[PDB]
Amino acid sequence: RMQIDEQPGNAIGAAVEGFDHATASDADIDALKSTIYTKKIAVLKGQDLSPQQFLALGKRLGRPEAYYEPMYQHPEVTEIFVSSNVPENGKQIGVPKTGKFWHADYQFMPDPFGITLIYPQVIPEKNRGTYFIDMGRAYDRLPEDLKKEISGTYCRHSVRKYFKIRPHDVYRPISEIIEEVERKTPAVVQPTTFTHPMTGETVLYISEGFTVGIEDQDGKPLDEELLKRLFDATGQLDESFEHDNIHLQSFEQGDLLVWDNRSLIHRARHTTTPEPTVSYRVTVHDERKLHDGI
Amino acid sequence: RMQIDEQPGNAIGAAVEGFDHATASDADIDALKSTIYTKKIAVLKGQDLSPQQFLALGKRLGRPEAYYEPMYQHPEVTEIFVSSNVPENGKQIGVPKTGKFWHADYQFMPDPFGITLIYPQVIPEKNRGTYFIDMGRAYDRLPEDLKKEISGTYCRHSVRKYFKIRPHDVYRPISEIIEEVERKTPAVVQPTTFTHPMTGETVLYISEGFTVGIEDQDGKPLDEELLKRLFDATGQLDESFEHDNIHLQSFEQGDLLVWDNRSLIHRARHTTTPEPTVSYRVTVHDERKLHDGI
Numbered sequence: 156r157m158q159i160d161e162q163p164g165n166a167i168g169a170a171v172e173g174f175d176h177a178t179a180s181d182a183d184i185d186a187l188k189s190t191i192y193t194k195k196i197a198v199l200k201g202q203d204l205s206p207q208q209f210l211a212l213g214k215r216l217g218r219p220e221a222y223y224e225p226m227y228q229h230p231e232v233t234e235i236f237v238s239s240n241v242p243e244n245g246k247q248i249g250v251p252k253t254g255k256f257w258h259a260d261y262q263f264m265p266d267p268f269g270i271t272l273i274y275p276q277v278i279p280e281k282n283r284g285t286y287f288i289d290m291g292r293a294y295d296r297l298p299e300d301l302k303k304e305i306s307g308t309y310c311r312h313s314v315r316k317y318f319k320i321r322p323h324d325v326y327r328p329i330s331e332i333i334e335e336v337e338r339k340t341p342a343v344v345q346p347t348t349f350t351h352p353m354t355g356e357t358v359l360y361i362s363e364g365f366t367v368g369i370e371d372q373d374g375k376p377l378d379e380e381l382l383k384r385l386f387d388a389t390g391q392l393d394e395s396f397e398h399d400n401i402h403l404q405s406f407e408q409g410d411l412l413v414w415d416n417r418s419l420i421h422r423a424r425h426t427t428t429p430e431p432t433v434s435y436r437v438t439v440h441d442e443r444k445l446h447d448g449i
Numbered sequence: 450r451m452q453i454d455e456q457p458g459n460a461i462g463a464a465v466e467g468f469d470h471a472t473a474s475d476a477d478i479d480a481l482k483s484t485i486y487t488k489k490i491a492v493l494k495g496q497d498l499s500p501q502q503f504l505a506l507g508k509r510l511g512r513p514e515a516y517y518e519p520m521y522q523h524p525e526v527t528e529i530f531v532s533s534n535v536p537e538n539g540k541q542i543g544v545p546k547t548g549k550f551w552h553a554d555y556q557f558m559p560d561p562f563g564i565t566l567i568y569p570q571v572i573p574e575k576n577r578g579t580y581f582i583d584m585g586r587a588y589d590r591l592p593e594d595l596k597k598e599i600s601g602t603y604c605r606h607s608v609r610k611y612f613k614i615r616p617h618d619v620y621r622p623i624s625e626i627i628e629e630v631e632r633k634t635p636a637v638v639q640p641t642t643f644t645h646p647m648t649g650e651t652v653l654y655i656s657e658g659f660t661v662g663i664e665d666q667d668g669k670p671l672d673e674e675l676l677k678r679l680f681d682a683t684g685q686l687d688e689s690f691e692h693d694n695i696h697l698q699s700f701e702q703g704d705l706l707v708w709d710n711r712s713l714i715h716r717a718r719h720t721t722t723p724e725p726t727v728s729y730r731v732t733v734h735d736e737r738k739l740h741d742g743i
């Protein structure tokens with residue numbers, strides 16, 4: 156039966172032993188969620204699930220949403236997003252090498268979900284794991300002059316930099332794809348900071364991957380140097396990943412990571428050698444919107 | 450033996466009967482070239498050539514250059530550019546539906562060639578042919594206030610709007626392809642008008658497909674409205690193709706079109722129904738650069 160072992164103090168993370176999604180109680184689920192919101196990353200140990208079972212687990216936490224671009228979808232379970240460089244029967248399943256940039260999931264969408272679940276299937280032996288930054292904690296550690304500068308500002312977020320070419324795009328003019336991206340997923344505006352609706356923390360909601368501009372309360376665009384200074388101060392421009400804000404989360408076979416997609420940004424690791432790597436993802440809406448202004 | 454029948458007066462075009470590239474004399478070649486430079490489009494009749502023979506024909510006119518992106522190249526004759534929606538043994542040969550925008554060939558490159566050759570292989574029965582505008586004649590017919598406005602200006606030309614996605618681009622982030630385009634083929638600058646080095650005509654060297662900006666002699670960028678007014682006045686924004694400058698060039702099996710790639714812009718026709726369409730192209734440098742300032 157479910158036992159949660161939280162990292163001590165303000166250290167990030169929690170290990171969850173004995174969890175079985177099909178027989179966990181309501182109270183088990185609420186406590187797991189409480190751990191996600193407070194410790195940001197919960198690592199479920201010893202999970203051996205089929206794709207259908209992984210979805211059922213995610214459904215225990217909230218309402219799953221399928222990724223809007225179908226080439227990412229698992230062929231049997233639409234709601235599973237697949238990152239994979241391992242062909243199955245010669246077919247490309249999902250998309251290779253996803254998320255190799257700092258971001259929060261669906262940050263470029265009007266209605267981001269609160270919880271992301273990763274179930275690694277094939278794990279590389281070398282550059283293994285995912286980097287994370289707690290942007291609530293990163294906000295708190297900002298120089299107080301930077302905190303005042305971004306007071307009352309809004310940021311615009313867009314998928315335009317990392318949108319991946321799809322198979323049916325081959326031979327099409329590049330400008331036609333760029334236009335389609337801007338039509339289907341126009342840039343969305345959020346307050347630069349917001350109150351986490353479960354914990355009350357102030358979250359700095361920006362990422363190098365998706366945040367493309369910042370403006371003041373009157374709508375006046377601000378020099379993008381302000382964004383670059385915020386990326387720099389929070390650790391997102393440190394290509395050595397030694398910055399104090401950066402947490403490297405590793406995992407072993409059977410681990411399943413569940414994390415706070417409001418508070419955290421993350422980034423896949425780049426591998427210097429070609430290794431098989433397959434991960435399944437489910438993304439779920441919980442009982443509140445991203446912040447209570449949505 | 451070669452007989453050239455020129456359209457009368459200032460009407461565009463010439464029919465060339467009895468031409469065989471392997472036994473044509475030097476004088477035949479010089480006269481064909483003279484017809485290209487003065488009548489802009491020469492239609493060689495009754496040509497039945499293999500890919501190797503088509504290249505040899507082009508070599509009679511000048512130095513062929515292979516297209517810089519290899520996916521366009523014929524699998525046996527590298528110097529042949531292939532536009533095709535007809536698979537050969539299940540393989541895509543060349544690129545489907547090329548050139549569906551106003552342009553001059555290689556206008557986005559530092560050193561454009563003077564002569565383009567098209568050898569249609571599979572010809573649609575419906576929307577057949579290629580549109581052309583003589584930009585020397587289009588310059589002459591400009592309102593004289595527009596002629597003064599563009600005096601001494603330079604234009605920048607770029608492939609960035611119609612660069613076609615390549616097979617190995619699938620699953621790559623769109624921004625990485627955009628960056629590669631700007632690195633390999635940065636925008637090139639030309640005088641807005643130049644003197645045709647064979648005929649002495651003044652050519653207005655712009656196209657809706659490739660011309661992305663205009664600036665004065667001091668390098669000061671000008672409102673892009675000036676380019677839009679030049680496109681409008683020369684017939685490039687008329688989506689009905691009824692404008693006085695536009696010439697529709699049709700062809701039948703065995704026709705081979707050779708044209709003045711300094712003076713002319715052109716545009717493939719859009720088909721409303723899916724029909725097989727295959728064309729081979731060779732592009733050749735003649736005895737002068739695009740203009741004598743290169």
Ligand SMILES: C[C@H](CC(=O)O)N[C@H](O)C(=O)O
Pocket residue numbers: 250252253254255259260261262263314317318319
């Ligand atoms: C662009 C990214 C996919 C990718 O990196 O290929 N989407 C995010 O994963 C998301 O859920 O917001």
Ligand SMILES: C[C@H](CC(=O)O)N[C@H](O)C(=O)O
Pocket residue numbers: 544546547548549553554555556557608611612613
């Ligand atoms: C972009 C275009 C190819 C295409 O339309 O796919 N290149 C031109 O044909 C040229 O030779 O300048």
Ligand SMILES: [Fe+2]
Pocket residue numbers: 254258259260421
């Ligand atoms: Fe992600």
Ligand SMILES: [Fe+2]
Pocket residue numbers: 548552553554715
């Ligand atoms: Fe062309």
